[PDB]
Design a protein around this ligand. Structure first.
Ligand SMILES: Nc1ncnc2c1ncn2[C@@H]1O[C@H](COP(=O)(O)OP(=O)(O)CP(=O)(O)O)[C@@H](O)[C@H]1O
Ligand SMILES: [Ca+2]
Ligand SMILES: [Mg+2]
Length: 893
């Protein structure tokens, strides 16, 4: 039986003894069958998840509300009296109400737990001698885990290989300085504090630099500080500010409703009316007017938006970011990953002498050739191009195999061009001795390699990079084999050629070589191509046209970036560009007045990205920046809508950013805006419908009380109307697919409220129309002195039909009834049908007849009510149509 090794003992114990105890193969990894056995015995590589879900507890918690308690008290006091039919009716009504509330809460909790836990932790592991790609959830104590830069440590590792490792342990230790890691055993005297353990990698820490490979010593709860981990991250309350605003609005509406109910009670009691019946009616109205489904529906619509985002490759965490996601003003993205595909090929070759050579072929394939202006070259014919491809081979770091690329796209394109000429065998012929790492701030890499067949000649350097960083280190050039020196008369024409290459759609680079890396010989430039991704130009145009001001932050040259922006809709006739030196000269103040006028940035850095973020946030704008680097993590954290990458993004940037895309494309941002605006529109629909229904009911009750005639609503019918107003139909209205025409609207403001003048006017119009219809029904209904329950049933049916028709036309503030389709959201149709059958059963069920005192009606009366109750829908449709037509005509003219 394998024992679990503690962190301190693993640090104390030698690596070989540790591997002996865990029976782990450091080279070939661990086999799958033993992986399954260890997983079965030790559980999975997860945190022990346990919580109380005693459904009877949440059933009881649905009770104890003051409204339900008062209803139960009224039921008890009626039981104490001589009446029992009212008591049984009220208790079955409150039972239906609490069951509806229970299913609403259950659905809300269900959506809550389908939310989150959607980005599993993923890390490398060695099994059966192969580096295989598993989730961290699959780990067992004994596997060999490879750690890379930017990867999050999945479990406690006993490090045995490490070259210049720095691990950010600020999360678990609080030290802002990453801790260097070693592999030697640690002394017992220094094994006291956590930070002194320099040979163990802890789960949840981020690797900042270096390479590593260790064996898991702990999984799940046995891991050190796992206790404090489940202490902090297990429970949290990240309340969305939109939820707070909705709660405040609901509380204000509830206070106003309570004031209205109190005024109505005072007026009725001062007028000498009923006591118990009026009290029950008032308490039913109070429980009706309270918006209780608003938080449930907002959680449901947030979860639905997140799920719809995920269904089409848009993973969004950090729930309250979605609320401000729709209020997007400025969008920034790179140019190699999000706008154009990462498929680079070289189609132009330029040398020191000057010969326009064109290269054909698309992709990393060997079908292709180099075409000078009339020649046939398949070998050592032109010395300049041969030297260029040889330098490309020497400076190359990646390796191409079976038409596959594993490395940076630029080196892949260079090696593909080299293989096209037939010199693929020179990549491994030269062996590097001194290596110069390539960096964003450096923009050039150098190698020191010599031929192995002969070593009489001294060392020769081969380096490539940007032209601005190449001509500075190069003052010699070749014409016909011999070495000469360049002057200004060649630098100017080289600059013109660089600009010409940067035009159209080509990328500009430079090749240099020499004996010592202080004086080289210029070779020429390579015309790497970069085709834009399909369906990006129209997306960019339709984004910038409406309300967005997308900018460009790319590391290319001036001409290349300008041409790429001109191909899309980013560049205009009034836009400028800021260089890296210029953006470094000014920190915040001088950059503020120029950021809204520049859409293309020169070769920048993560520090420059931070500067742009600070300048944009100073002006008061929302920025959505996408990054794929370790040093872009701070930029993503500072940005409110920072986006990470799935395939080209590290784990550090994945965790730091609030949005992760499994595919790099400039199409999910419009999708983010569309779902955000759609869920906002659904919330507006719910709010408008609930407010209109509540206002109509309260106005009808107030007019009934003030005019001194019995109210044709009772209490059970009021409870049914309440269930309709915030229940299955209200949630059906809240659940709605995103409208196609929702992107042609200026971005929303974060400080804007939910109630507008148009919404208030529509609510008032609908309420007054419903009230007028009910008054007309009553006037045509009571033409004598005899009052029957049939009249009350007819009034209740008219009110139900009016509410249903209002909900029918409340699913679109701008679209018509037939524009979205009669059957688009099947949930709404199902709810309407269920309400219809429930009303019919209430009318025609002897038990429900006794409960609801509905008596009976006729087919002709029902048809007349249906014909009359359609007034709200037609009026709303015509006013919406005329308003939309007038707005479109005015904006067109
Ligand atoms: N393998 C390589 N060797 C030498 N230079 C390289 C290189 N890859 C890129 N460069 C140089 O680095 C410069 C800027 O590159 P950087 O990596 O900062 O951004 P980038 O090339 O990835 C474009 P972007 O950031 O918009 O995706 C380019 O002009 C290029 O000349
Ligand atoms: Ca209510
Ligand atoms: Mg970049």
């Amino acid at each position: 039986m394998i024992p679990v090794l503690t962190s301190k003992k693993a640090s104390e114990l030698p690596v070989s003894e540790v591997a002996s105890i865990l029976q782990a193969d450091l080279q070939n990894g661990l086999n799958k069958c033993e992986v399954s056995h260890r997983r079965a015995f030790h559980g999975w590589n997860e945190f022990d998840i346990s919580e109380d879900e005693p459904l009877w507890k949440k059933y009881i918690s649905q009770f104890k509300n003051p409204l339900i308690m008062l209803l139960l008290a009224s039921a008890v006091i009626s039981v104490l009296m001589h009446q029992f039919d009212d008591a049984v009716s009220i208790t079955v009504a409150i039972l239906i109400v609490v069951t509806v509330a229970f299913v609403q809460e259950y659905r809300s909790e269900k959506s809550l737990e389908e939310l989150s836990k959607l980005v599993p932790p993923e890390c490398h592991c060695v099994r059966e001698g192969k580096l295989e790609h598993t989730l961290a959830r699959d780990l067992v104590p004994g596997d060999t885990v490879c750690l890379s830069v930017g990867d999050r440590v999945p479990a406690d590792l006993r490090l045995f290989e490490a070259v210049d490792l720095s691990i950010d342990e600020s999360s678990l230790t609080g030290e802002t300085t990453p801790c260097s890691k070693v592999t030697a055993p640690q002394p017992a005297a220094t094994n006291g504090d956590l930070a002194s353990r320099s040979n163990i990698a802890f789960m949840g820490t981020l690797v900042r630099c270096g390479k590593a490979k260790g064996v898991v010593i702990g999984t799940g709860e046995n891991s050190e500080f796992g206790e404090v981990f489940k202490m902090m991250q297990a429970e949290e309350a990240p309340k969305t500010p939109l939820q707070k605003s909705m709660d405040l609005l609901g509380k204000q509406l509830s206070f106003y409703s309570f004031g209205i109910i109190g005024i109505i009670m005072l007026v009725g009691w001062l007028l000498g009316k009923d006591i118990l019946e009026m009290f029950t009616i008032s308490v039913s109205l109070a429980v009706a007017a309270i918006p209780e489904g608003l938080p449930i529906v907002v959680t449901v619509t947030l979860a639905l938006g997140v799920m719809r985002m995920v269904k089409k490759r848009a993973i969004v965490k950090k729930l309250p970011i979605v609320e401000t996601l729709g209020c997007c003003n400025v969008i920034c993205s790179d140019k190699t990953g999000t706008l154009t595909k990462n498929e680079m090929t070289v189609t132009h070759i330029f040398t020191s002498d000057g010969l326009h050579a064109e290269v054909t072929g698309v992709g990393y394939n060997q079908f292709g050739e180099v075409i000078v202006d009339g020649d046939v070259v398949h070998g050592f014919y032109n010395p300049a191009v041969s030297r260029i491809v040889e330098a490309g081979c020497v400076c190359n770091d990646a390796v191409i195999r079976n038409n596959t690329l594993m490395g940076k796209p630029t080196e892949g394109a260079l090696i593909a061009l080299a293989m096209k000429m037939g010199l693929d065998g020179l990549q491994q012929d030269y062996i590097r001795k001194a290596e110069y790492p390539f960096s964003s701030e450096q923009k050039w890499m150098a190698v020191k390699c010599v031929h192995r067949t002969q070593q009489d000649r001294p060392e020769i350097c081969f380096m490539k990079g940007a032209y601005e960083q190449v001509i500075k280190y190069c003052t010699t050039y070749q014409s016909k084999g011999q070495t000469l020196t360049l002057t200004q008369q060649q630098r100017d024409v080289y600059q013109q050629e660089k600009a010409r290459m940067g035009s159209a759609g080509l990328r500009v680079l430079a090749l240099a070589s020499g004996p010592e890396l202080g004086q080289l010989t210029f070779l020429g430039l390579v015309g790497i191509i970069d085709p834009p991704r399909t369906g990006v130009k129209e997306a960019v145009t339709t984004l910038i046209a409406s309300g967005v001001s997308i900018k460009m932050i790319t590391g290319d040259s001036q001409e290349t970036a300008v041409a790429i922006a001109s191909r899309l809709g980013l560049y205009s006739k009034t836009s400028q560009s800021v260089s890296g030196e210029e953006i470094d000269a000014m920190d915040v103040q001088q950059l503020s007045q120029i950021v809204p006028k520049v859409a293309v940035f020169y070769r920048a850095s993560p520090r420059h990205k931070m500067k742009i973020i600070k300048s944009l946030q100073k002006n008061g704008s929302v920025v959505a920046m996408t990054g794929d680097g370790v040093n872009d993590a701070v930029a993503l954290k500072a940005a409110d809508i920072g986006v990470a990458m799935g395939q080209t993004g590290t784990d550090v940037c994945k965790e730091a950013a609030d949005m992760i895309l499994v595919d790099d494309d400039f199409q999910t941002i419009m999708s983010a805006i569309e779902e955000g605006k759609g869920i906002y529109n659904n919330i507006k629909n719910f709010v408008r419908f609930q407010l209109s229904t509540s206002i109509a009911a309260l106005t009808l009750i107030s007019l009934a009380t003030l005019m001194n005639f019995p109210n044709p609503l009772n209490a059970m019918q009021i409870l049914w109307i309440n269930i309709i107003m915030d229940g299955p139909p209200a949630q059906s209205l809240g659940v709605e697919p995103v409208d196609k025409d929702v992107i042609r609207k200026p971005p929303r403001n974060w400080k804007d409220s939910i109630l507008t003048k148009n919404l208030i006017l529509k609510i008032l119009v609908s309420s007054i129309i419903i009230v007028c219809g009910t008054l007309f029904v009553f006037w045509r209904e009571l033409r004598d002195n005899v009052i029957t329950p049939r009249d009350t049933t007819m009034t209740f049916t008219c009110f139900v039909f009016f509410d249903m028709f209002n909900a029918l036309s409340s699913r679109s503030q701008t679209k018509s009834v037939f524009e979205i389709g009669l059957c688009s959201n099947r949930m709404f149709c199902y709810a309407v049908l269920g309400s219809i059958m429930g009303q019919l059963l209430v009318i025609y069920f002897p038990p429900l007849q006794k409960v609801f005192q509905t008596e009976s009606l006729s087919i002709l009366d029902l048809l007349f009510l249906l014909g009359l109750t359609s007034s709200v829908c037609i009026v709303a449709e015509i006013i919406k149509k005329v308003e939309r037509s007038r707005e479109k005509i005015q904006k067109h003219v």
